[PDB]
Amino acid sequence: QLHCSYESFDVESGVYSVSSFEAKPSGSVVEQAEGVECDFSPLLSGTPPQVYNFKRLVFTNCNYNLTKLLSLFSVNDFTCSQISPAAIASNCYSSLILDYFSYPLSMKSDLSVSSAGPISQFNYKQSFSNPTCLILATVPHNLTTITKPLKYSYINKCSRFLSDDRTEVPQLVNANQYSPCVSIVPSTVWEDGDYYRKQLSPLEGGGWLVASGSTVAMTEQLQMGFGITVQYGTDTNSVCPKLEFANDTKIASQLGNCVEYSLYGVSGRGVFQNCTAVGVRQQRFVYDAYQNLVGYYSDDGNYYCLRACVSVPVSVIYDKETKTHATLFGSVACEHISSTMSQYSRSTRSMLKRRDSTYGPLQTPVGCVLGLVNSSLFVEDCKLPLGQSLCALP
Amino acid sequence: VPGEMRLASIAFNHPIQVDQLNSSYFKLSIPTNFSFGVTQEYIQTTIQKVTVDCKQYVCNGFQKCEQLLREYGQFCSKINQALHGANLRQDDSVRNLFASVKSSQSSPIIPGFGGDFNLTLLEPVARSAIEDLLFDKVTIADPGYMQGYDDCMQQGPASARDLICAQYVAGYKVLPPLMDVNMEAAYTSSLLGSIAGVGWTAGLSSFAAIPFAQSIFYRLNGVGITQQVLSENQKLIANKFNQALGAMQTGFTTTNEAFHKVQDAVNNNAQALSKLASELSNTFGAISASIGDIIQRLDPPEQDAQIDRLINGRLTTLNAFVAQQLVRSESAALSAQLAKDKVNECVKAQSKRSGFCGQGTHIVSFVVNAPNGLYFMHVGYYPSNHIEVVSAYGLCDAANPTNCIAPVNGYFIKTNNTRIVDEWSYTGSSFYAPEPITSLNTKYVAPQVTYQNISTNLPPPLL
Amino acid sequence: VPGEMRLASIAFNHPIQVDQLNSSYFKLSIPTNFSFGVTQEYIQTTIQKVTVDCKQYVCNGFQKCEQLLREYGQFCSKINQALHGANLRQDDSVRNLFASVKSSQSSPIIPGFGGDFNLTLLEPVARSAIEDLLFDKVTIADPGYMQGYDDCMQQGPASARDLICAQYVAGYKVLPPLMDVNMEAAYTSSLLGSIAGVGWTAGLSSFAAIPFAQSIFYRLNGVGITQQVLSENQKLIANKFNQALGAMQTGFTTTNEAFHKVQDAVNNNAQALSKLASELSNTFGAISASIGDIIQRLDPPEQDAQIDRLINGRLTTLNAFVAQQLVRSESAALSAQLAKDKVNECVKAQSKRSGFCGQGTHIVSFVVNAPNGLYFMHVGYYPSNHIEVVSAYGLCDAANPTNCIAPVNGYFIKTNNTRIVDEWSYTGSSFYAPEPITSLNTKYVAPQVTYQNISTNLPPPLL
Amino acid sequence: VPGEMRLASIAFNHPIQVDQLNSSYFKLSIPTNFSFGVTQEYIQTTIQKVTVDCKQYVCNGFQKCEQLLREYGQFCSKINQALHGANLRQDDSVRNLFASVKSSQSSPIIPGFGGDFNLTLLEPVARSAIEDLLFDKVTIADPGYMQGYDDCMQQGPASARDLICAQYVAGYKVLPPLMDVNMEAAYTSSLLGSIAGVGWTAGLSSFAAIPFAQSIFYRLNGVGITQQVLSENQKLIANKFNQALGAMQTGFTTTNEAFHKVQDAVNNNAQALSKLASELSNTFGAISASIGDIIQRLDPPEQDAQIDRLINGRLTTLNAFVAQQLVRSESAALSAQLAKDKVNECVKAQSKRSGFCGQGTHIVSFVVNAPNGLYFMHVGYYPSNHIEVVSAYGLCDAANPTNCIAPVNGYFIKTNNTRIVDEWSYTGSSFYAPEPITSLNTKYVAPQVTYQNISTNLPPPLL
């Protein structure tokens, strides 16, 4: 690595830092769930709404298998943003939110998160604060509890006329919210181009509310649209996939190495110990000034202090005249150093093993080393100094 | 309760006025009192040396970076080059310092060293009493070194909030200092033992080992004080001197700016690393600062896009950091050169250069091993209670003007003391104290019109 | 009309050659004329201190920035940190300077000060005559301070094109200098009054108040000129000296590089601010540099996009600017330290160090308060009309060789003057002027083979 | 084969201990041997001056850039401003140096100069023998200058891989150095010929031309060695000295750090340009780094897009480069000032300051024209074989205590030599060598209790 980094077949004698040991983190534990199913049964019946009449489902504290839900439809469009279509199923969240509506496959043209169409102007907007997986699908003929609207319809106008009856100002739909014009608009648009107007009071700032809509012919099998989004929280991440914890080792108490983990969907790896809970309880996860977890106020009544994860800094002491070297691990101490290793820094350290196939680690004041004789001699000029009064005698 | 702040003006320290006068005499301002005093300074000599595992700092083993950083592998080679050389520069300066510090010979230091003076400052043969006090006063976060990382490791107090341990996250390596504190103490002890001789001929190869108080007197004879006074008031001088020494115990405050400078030197080093630490959390407008997170949250095309953004921001931080460090390192090197010069002239010997050292001219000085640098103390003589007296430009025999005389390191004062029958008296230049005019107080000079026309009684010479 | 430029080579100033000679004598090059002269320098001591309202500089109260800059509010906190500390560093150095400037005592300065010399340079008790001339010569744009901003305000001459007032646009604040010009003058006056004594024993606590011209002679005795000559030619010396002084009136030109350096110091400070000013107009590829304009011209999504671009460019400029200023500030601090040292040795006293001060060795020097720094003048003696003469290595009595003598601060010259019956003569080392060899011109030394074998007539001693 | 590296500790050079003793006498450490030695340094004085054709560096006449760079034409005006001024700063320092280098008079330098010493170092009237050896030792890539570019041109060896010629691609211009090497040699020769006088009164206007070896002795008398010894051992002294001189032939190695510093100075300049050269190939994520290529490969809208990206990266490199150069230039200027000071005190004269020059106190020194700077050698006296001897604080007549005496530049040693009947002996402070106590070895002083109570035999004075 050194030769390559300096693009030469003879790097000059010196002491050089090299890549650190990864410290081989142990197999994962979780603190996810307990919970109830994220039952989706509202989706199983009735006529789904016009796009300005949204029906919304929100889940907390619950467990799911969305592929079973998906089996109930034939999806003719699965697209997503800020997340893979797979990952939206695999990930735990603080909430799972689904908006559903009737929507044909002719007009199915105007649904996208970036669409500038009248569907997005007046009927739906999707925030980019959350990942969102959009679905367009059709209803199978054996979903007889599903019913279909006489036409598929939407708002194509929602603006306010000025009280002087000349100037007019549009009211665009807010993200994840209903446009105000839904208060005057009929539950479905009866005829294409239907329009309605409401005079506005001085309490309302004057003017006229003016709105209109458009329709699409009904189809033999119902077409449906789904907007699905997720929220990530802190100690509220309680919507998760159903656990596969059956037939597994006891969790999360190992401790152990810096174990990889997912605690209610909070993932990472780290060292834990039972240790003095700090303010304030029932927040579960408390973090430092850099938003790194300090520790976990666990459900088992133990506060677990996070001590992160470890690595071993390491360097090479190279004497090019003899073509030999020594190495340092230092403050880690020889408790974690052995004749072979797999944490790891390099795939091999055979360069040391050139002699150190026959030698153990030595403990020093800077700390644990390899490739060195304990001569304990006194040197006038170290040549390759180790700091303090330490020395790599040639 | 306090009221309003007060609007005010800056005082001007008006110096005593003296008027030049016509003809053979003039006014002389001369102290009739003085106090010992100590000037103090901290000279930083080093930057805390660091390096980083310049891969793990960016991505902690993440597989995309294992390929993406192939593109820029030479970047971190250059990062390492700069840092590594800089670290060596720091080491070079340390060795240079100690080369100058070493003396061929020295006194042993004993309890009771300094003779009449307590020297409570002395090392308890450790660091000097002052050094240990200072070191404890500083709000230092000790580097680990050993066992270091085994306190990172969960061995008891997980409440160890120190970013000193957090280096393992970033791949930081605070590098070791280049001298054992005991050897530093040994070097410092040899500096202490290099006192006396201070002057005494060349003083460089010769080693005299001569009375501590008389070495002061010797320096005070160089200051311009007669030995008669120095001997006679020896006990009082010792008292005044030791009071000035005792005042050092109140110096461990930020009211001492040099003490505050030490504090800031620590702050500077600490801050640089803390900045880098913050940057690990710096989401760059990415889906997240965590690569593992964005992997879970993204299709791999987007994972790449986000990771690219993250990498660029992370590398930019590293680059800028190194540049700053290069500057810092150089500044420290130059600062160390200055300190070395100050040891050579302002510490190893009395200095007559003025400007530097004490502001009471200068006698003895000391230097100690402040963290990351050196702290000096300079003892001097601060004159007071000045009076104006008459002085002659010189004296001649008016009966034989080829003979004239001029005071040496002092002045010809009109007699105002009851012990002196002579019209004129002599005082040492540094302090008011009348003496007889004798051969050792004067030298033969050519005549000048401003020299007194003395036709009566001269003792140096008779005529 | 001019023709072609001329191709030429650089002249070499060939020094006078002198040959070393065999045995008891050698050549000596010694001046038979000289001129007074003055070397001059400008040492910058400070950077013009500034800060900025680091919000208004970016957006002048615009509502989008009221939210967008929430994201980066800590950025400008860091901007302020750096600038603020830097501004303090400048202030620190000013106080450090004046601590060294202050003297315990001084002469009053009067009209007719300097005795035989006009000293037209003197302050008209204001600034020194020279300082006021210099200050007017510089093409300075005065900072407002007071009433400042009321000339920004439309009170008469709206033709005031000064970017000095335009600070209100940018939020710039040129910060105040740390000393009242009158107090600076007072300090400078005390420096002037610290002259004489210059030497005269230690000279540090004692204050002599002694003849200005004779203080020069005293320094010239230190130069190596006998007092007999100094007295005899006193009027001529005074003339030559005052001619050198009169030449200072032509020094207010950029032919004096130090004068030009002052001009550039002003330019440096002015330029930095002008750069920032230009950047306010720097559309960054945005719809416009004006936020209000792009608000009128855009839907609010696009307003945000454009404002983001604008903000990034504006902040980048601020960041880089501060970094440069930090560098400048440090450089000035170090430059000020040098100046302080020059005051201590090259101004407060005669210097024998060479190199610095004058290039005619050195006598008296002066320092004045140039804008943003100090300007020094160093008077010296520039030898000329050198001749080679014979000199003896030393002399001994050949009848009693245990006695030998060696000239002190001068040489044993083969006699070439009609007043001297003696085979050998003496001259002061600084200048050719024969004198009798007498006891005060020599000292007793051990014999050497190169010393003359004089068996005849010696007067110091008789034998 | 080699085994394991050895773990070891750092040796401490323990200085000789000396104990302070009670009453009228004390220990003195004094050498009974010494060696000559030479300390050596390289001071860089300049940065290789360069500029660039800041248009062709970006685009080599490409038509899109002929319009695109209209937008940023002022950018390169600013690039040029900074570089141009920096280049002048370098030139300024060169002229400043030589102003100090010039002497009013000097010796001619001859073969056989240096008398008893070979001085194989001398220029073969070229550069000094040492300078030419050094210059050949350095792995320099010579700048072209003339004929330069006609070796760029295919005139024979197209295997000339030098990036020295490749400047024509980038538009680089390595600018010319400001002095002819012959004139530099002339200046250096005048410096050599300015030796002797070194001291000898003021030594500044006077020129003595006095025995080279005796000038050494003169300096050694200043060191503290009696002339009797200096004369008697003259041949041996000459031998030891010339051995120290002969050792210089082994100095052309990187074991001499100063030699290595020269090597790195070359590396620094070379590296900066090589970096810029690499950047010409730096595709910036563009379709290609070559504009001509992307023109062939793109519709003109995309050509513009790619060229914009290329330009931005290219200009960014230029900008950063200049900034670094500005820093370098300043550093060199300051380094040159230091060198100038070292010539003035450490070369033109003996220095008693310690610290600098030699580490054997100091006698003569030399300076030579290293590439891009100056290389100094400082001769000194390194004491050895120290012994402790008895010394008296001073002596008085116990029958008439108003008389006392104190050794001058030496000590009153208890007699341990068979030639001296007297109880006490004298030695020069620099070296152990007994002598009789006589008037020239002592001075009259006031009595002190530590002075010996001698009631018997004094020769200086009789009583």
Angle among Cα B251, B256, B261 to the nearest 5 degrees reads 120
User: Is the CB of C446 less than 8 angstroms away from the CB of D439?
Assistant: no
List all chains that touch chain D, counting a touch as 3 or more CB pairs closer than 8 Å.
A, B, C
Q: Which residues contact B95 (CB under 8 A, 6 or more apart)?
A: B178
D182 Cβ partners below 8 Å, 6+ apart?
Answer: none
CB within 8 Å: A290 and B149? no
Q: Which two tokens stand for residue C155?
A: 């009170």
Q: What angle, 0 to 180 degrees and rounded to 10, lies between the N-to-C axes of helices D212-223 and D234-246?
A: 100
Q: Do B171 and A292 touch (CB under 8 A)?
A: no
Looking at C128-233, list the stretches that DSSP marks H as alpha helix, in order from N- to C-terminal side: 129-137, 149-152, 167-170, 181-192, 212-223, 227-232
Hey, of A13, A358, A375, A384, which one would you mutate to test binding to chain D, going by the most D CBs within 10 A of its CB? A375
Q: Name which of A82, A306, A331 is nearest B145 (Cβ-Cβ).
A: A331
Tell if the CB–CB gap between A371 and D4 is shorter than 8 Å: yes
Rounded to the nearest angstrom, the minimum Cα separation between D423 and chain B is: 20
CB crowding D17-28: b at 16 or more within 10 Å, else e? bbebeeebebbb
What count of CB pairs under 8 Å joins B to C?
104
Sign of CA dihedral D407, D410, D411, D417: negative
Rg (CA), chain D: 32
Interchain proximity A373–D2, CB inside 8 Å:
no
Do the Cβ atoms of D241 and D117 come closer than 8 Å? Answer: yes
Q: DSSP labels for C223-234?
A: HT--HHHHHHTH
Q: Are B417 and B438 in contact (CB under 8 A)?
A: no
CB contact under 8 A, C354 and D204: yes
Would you list the DSSP string of C218-273? HHHHHHT--HHHHHHTHHHHHHHHHHHHHGGGG--STTSHHHHHHHHHHHHHHHHH
Structure-determination approach: cryo-EM
Contact D6 A394 (CB under 8 A): yes
| CA–CA distance, C448 with C401 (Å, rounded to integer) | 9
* DSSP 8-state secondary structure symbol assigned to residue D194: T
**Alpha carbon of B432: minimum distance to chain C alpha carbons (Å):** 10
Question: Do the Cβ atoms of C108 and B17 come within 8 Å?
Answer: yes
What's the rounded Cα separation, in Å, for the pair D75 and B248?
57
Please judge whether D30 and B205 are an interchain contact, meaning their C-beta atoms are less than 8 angstroms apart.
Answer: yes
Compare CB distances from A333 to B150, B177, B287 and report the shortest one's residue. B150
State whether B345 and D361 contact (CB < 8 Å).
no
Test D26 with B204 for CB contact under 8 angstroms. no
CA distances from C443 to B408, C46, C199, C460, D302 (A): 18, 51, 24, 9, 92
Between helix B300-342 and helix B257-279 the angle, nearest 10°, is 160
- Where is B427: in which H helix or E strand? strand B424-428
Q: Do D209 and C15 touch (CB under 8 A)?
A: no
Window 38-57 of B: residues touching A by CB (8 A cutoff) are 51, 53, 55-56
Contacts of residue B444, Cβ cutoff 8 Å, sequence gap at least 6: B403, B404, B405, C439, C440
Instruction: Look at residues C146, C157, C99, C156 and name the one whose alpha carbon lies nearest to residue C336.
Output: C99
Question: Distance (Å, rounded) from C-alpha A306 to C-alpha A315?
Answer: 28
Of D4, D7, D11, Cβ closest to residue A378: D11
B58 closest CA partner among B165, B174, B169? B169
- Residues belonging to chain C with any Cβ–Cβ distance to chain B shorter than 8 Å: 100, 102-108, 180, 183, 186, 190, 193, 196, 200-202, 204-212, 214, 226-228, 231, 330, 340-341, 344-345, 348-349, 439-440
- Residues for chain D: how many in total? 463
Chain A residues with beta carbon closer than 8 angstroms to that of B144 = 331
Of the candidates A325, A373, A389, the beta carbon closest to that of D6 is on A373
Contact C201 B10 (CB under 8 A): no
Find chains touching chain A: ≥3 CB pairs under 8 Å: B, D
Which residues 54-93 of B are in CB contact (within 8 Å) with A? Answer: 55-56, 61, 73, 77, 80, 84, 91
Q: Can you tell me the distance from the alpha carbon of A326 to that of A4, in angstroms, rounded to the nearest whole number?
A: 19
D21 contacts on B by Cβ (under 8 Å): 209
Residue C196 and residue C215 in contact, taking contact as beta carbons nearer than 8 Å: yes
Closest-CA residue of B relative to A312 is B168
Q: Do B100 and D28 touch (CB under 8 A)?
A: no
Burial of C441 (0-12, 13-18, 19+ CB in 10 A): buried
D touches B, CB cut-off 8 Å, minimum 3 pairs: yes
CA distances from residue D431 to D229, D351, D380, D386 in whole angstroms, order as listed: 10, 19, 14, 9
Q: How far is D12 from chain A (nearest CA, A)?
A: 8
Which residue of chain D comes nearest to B183, CA vs CA? D12
Query: Which of the residues A17, A337, A362, A381 would you substitute to probe the B interface, choosing the one with the greatest number of B C-beta atoms within 10 Å?
Result: A17
Please report how many Cα atoms fall inside a 13 Å half-sphere around the Cα of residue B215, on the Cβ side.
23
Among D204, D221, D226, the residue to mutate for chain C (most C Cβ within 10 A): D204
Chain D residues near residue C320 by CB distance under 8 angstroms: none
Contact: D446, B440; criterion CB under 8 Å: yes
Whether residue B424 contacts residue B25, with contact meaning beta carbons closer than 8 Å, is answered with: no
Q: How far apart are the first and last CA of chain B?
A: 77
Side chain identity at residue A261, one-letter code: Y
Chains C and A physically touch (3 or more Cβ atom pairs below 8 Å): no
For C33, list phi and psi in degrees, rounded to 5. -145, 170
The minimum CA-CA distance between D77 and chain A, rounded to whole Å, is 37
Judge: B206–D30 Cβ closer than 8 Å, yes or no.
yes
Q: In the structure encoding, which two tokens stand for residue D373, read together?
A: 């700077």
- Cβ(B391)–Cβ(B25) below 8 Å: yes
Give chain B positions within 8 Å (CB) of A309.
Answer: 168-169
Chains that touch B (3 or more CB pairs under 8 A): A, C, D
Q: Which residues contact B70 (CB under 8 A, 6 or more apart)?
A: none
Closest-CA residue to C278 (of C163, C140, C442): C163
Cβ–Cβ of D29/B183 closer than 8 Å?
Answer: no
- Contacts of residue A148, defined as CB under 8 A and 6 or more positions apart, other chains included, come to A47, A102, A139, A218, A219, A222
How far does CA D239 lie from the centroid of its chain?
Answer: 25
CA geometry: angle D407, D408, D414, nearest 5 deg = 30
Closest C-alpha to A30, from A286, A262, A371, A193 = A262
Residues 6+ apart with CB under 8 A from D110: none
Other residues' Cβ atoms within 10 Å of the Cβ of residue C305: 15
Nearest alpha carbon to residue B101 among B197, B48, B166, B179: B179
Residue A112 Cα distances to A109, A125, A226, B301, angstroms: 8, 9, 11, 20
Q: Which residues pair with B413 in a beta bridge?
A: B391, B425
Q: Please give the Cα distance from B31 to B389 (Å, whole number).
A: 10
Broken C–N links (> 2.5 Å) in chain B, after residues: 125
- C11 to chain D, minimum CA–CA distance in Å? 10
Residues of A in contact with B287 (CB under 8 A): 82
Count interface pairs A-B at CB distance under 8 A: 126
Closest residue in A to B180 (Cα–Cα): A388
Q: To which H or E segment does residue B294 belong?
A: helix B291-297
